[PDB]
Ligand binder design. Sequence first.
Ligand SMILES: *Cc1c(COP(=O)(O)O)cnc(C)c1O
Ligand SMILES: *Cc1c(COP(=O)(O)O)cnc(C)c1O
Ligand SMILES: [Cl-]
Ligand SMILES: [Cl-]
Ligand SMILES: [Cl-]
Ligand SMILES: [Mg+2]
Ligand SMILES: [Mg+2]
Ligand SMILES: [Mg+2]
Ligand SMILES: [Mg+2]
Lengths: 387, 386
Amino acid sequence: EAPFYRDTWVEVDLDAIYNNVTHIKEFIPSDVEIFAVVKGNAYGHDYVPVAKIALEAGATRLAVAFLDEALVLRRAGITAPILVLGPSPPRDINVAAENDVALTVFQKEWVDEAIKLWDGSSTMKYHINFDSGMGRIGIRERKELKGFLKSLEGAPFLELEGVYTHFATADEVETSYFDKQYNTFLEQLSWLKEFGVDPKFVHTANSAATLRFQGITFNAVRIGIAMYGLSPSVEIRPFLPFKLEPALSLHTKVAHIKQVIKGDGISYNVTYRTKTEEWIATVAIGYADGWLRRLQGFEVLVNGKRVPIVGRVTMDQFMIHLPCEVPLGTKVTLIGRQGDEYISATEVAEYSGTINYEIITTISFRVPRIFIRNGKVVEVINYLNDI
Amino acid sequence: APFYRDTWVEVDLDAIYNNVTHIKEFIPSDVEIFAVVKGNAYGHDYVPVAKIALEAGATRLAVAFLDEALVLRRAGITAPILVLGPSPPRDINVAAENDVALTVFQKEWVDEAIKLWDGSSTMKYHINFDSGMGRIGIRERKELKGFLKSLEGAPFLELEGVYTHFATADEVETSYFDKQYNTFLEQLSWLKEFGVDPKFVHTANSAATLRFQGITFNAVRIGIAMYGLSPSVEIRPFLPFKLEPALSLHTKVAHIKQVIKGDGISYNVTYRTKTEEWIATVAIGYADGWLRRLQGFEVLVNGKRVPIVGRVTMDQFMIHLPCEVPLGTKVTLIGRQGDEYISATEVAEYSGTINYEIITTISFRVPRIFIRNGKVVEVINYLNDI
Ligand SMILES: *Cc1c(COP(=O)(O)O)cnc(C)c1O
Ligand SMILES: *Cc1c(COP(=O)(O)O)cnc(C)c1O
Ligand SMILES: [Cl-]
Ligand SMILES: [Cl-]
Ligand SMILES: [Cl-]
Ligand SMILES: [Mg+2]
Ligand SMILES: [Mg+2]
Ligand SMILES: [Mg+2]
Ligand SMILES: [Mg+2]
């Protein structure tokens, strides 16, 4: 339990993550594996505890965005397979090999450069990304694949572990583009067949695709958002096959409370004035914590009541208009439950003109995370203590 | 200090040194500077910024909350540090033990601190007077009296200074600033009426310090101007000297492809190509603090402004280029590249926000490279530390 000295914190309920992974594992075929996707500081829940609980719940593999994230996991004693999903520079080849991290590799040019940087003994695992319509990274054309495979002839130290694609629209109700991607991916698999390469270990499905569609499980699925207990989109939420259990909540405490006379200003540039004598509370969280200025006017929870953020959000603090005096130290919930009220990360996202993924994942490293298992605090991680 | 993705922040320590030096020479010789390093030094990193600011003549540091102060203490910084934000009473002993001053302004805080005191430590505090910011601080005379009463039972709390903060010092027109100033003088009069010397008075942030007479008192608290950025566009022409931006943000072309006419880019196919287009991908996204609302913003590639196309993803985004470039081509998101410069303000304007928010929210997962005399002197990759 790392110490922390501001009463602002994230709570991660490891039971929720465990349950979500267990439920997805039950839902997919028995011969299909789960990559627990922990990119972006585990979508703001913290790399290591999420990886550990997901593995305990039956995920067998992990995925991250870039190599440094994988190394966090390795230094924590995790030995499960780890795949980097984003692109990596060729200079990463020996370090990834040494740390048993597979990279996404999909360019002849990368292979050409890796040959130049290879230490002459390391074997690095890779997965081919096929771009079937996401348009981000990955191979798109047959002749492109051919060239890539030709370059690999000069790089025996690169060992294919698997092959994958990613869906751009699986969280949309209408499924035309998803169907096109699926058909394109099968065409792309047939290029490998033509060129004499076994894809070995095929994976396509994110949370949305996994929880919707038949016949896209292949050998493994890659679960991010649903593991954290949130719907990939508002439009598919109503028809998920079972209830997802949100893992993350975000809380602070009333740091000051005062009665502000009618007409007085609150915060930078005096964008709010009290309409009567008003109870104004202040809390020690702000945009440096990832709680952005665009959340001005959003309603947080105090005593199970929705109360608005008033005046400009500052770097480290914001102000709230309460109906009644409350004691200093009163719990203020930004994401989560008080009484019969619940503020979801999606509701925060909607007010903010964004998506839940971005809200959770941008909660700053300066905010401590408290980890709960069976209702009890089992770990506190305060990254500020580490730096 | 190693890092394994070609995405990074560069912090020019010369720029910070020069800004602090210029402020020091602009203000009276008997006025101290707090280097304000809250929010991971506005995204530039707590420790190197504290170090260079002190070298340049700042004498004190300020942070938002106690954990930030402890980062500095663990790094061997020994200069005074003040926590500007509120702190829970349970912080009393740890603050004292680490020679950190807290902002204290509530009888209730003192009452609780008395309960939690370890019985030996002495803690320094500054009184915050709220002269119109409406955030924290004492507002009323009777409230001040109750606070001083409560102190009679807490002989282990030691006054180090008194301050307020301006809400509108970055606005051209000055009515609200003048109102706060007059209110603050009244609040100081109350303190002096109650027999208490304020000892060490400070009020001015970057905008107030650079603009106004009679508000330097004993010290000024500099954030944004230390980092080389104007508190606002509207006061930028009024600044007494040129500020030198310290922070830039870069990445490299990680993929490049020619995408046929009509094909989709990124989630929900919000962009389709008009012709056969060159589309580049870079390894930075919203988990790095580069938000979805920057879709359509123009970044710099080979000294040319080129648009972000399709939805920004967690760790990557795409760019439409007029021509093929090699893998590894530098992409600049904030700062200078060739014949172009993108200010944090420009990013902020497109984003519907302010420069402060842009720089401060660059994630701890992005490495910072520190430049002094045109040379790399330090690399900090917080991911290696956790
Ligand atoms: C983000 C990501 C995932 C996880 O997606 P969710 O919607 O969070 O399930 C899976 N695969 C790739 C390639 C990703 O980028
Ligand atoms: C943020 C802050 C500062 C620094 O303000 P700049 O505009 O960045 O100079 C000074 N004092 C207090 C109390 C602050 O919160
Ligand atoms: Cl992809
Ligand atoms: Cl189906
Ligand atoms: Cl304040
Ligand atoms: Mg008044
Ligand atoms: Mg309560
Ligand atoms: Mg339980
Ligand atoms: Mg007395």
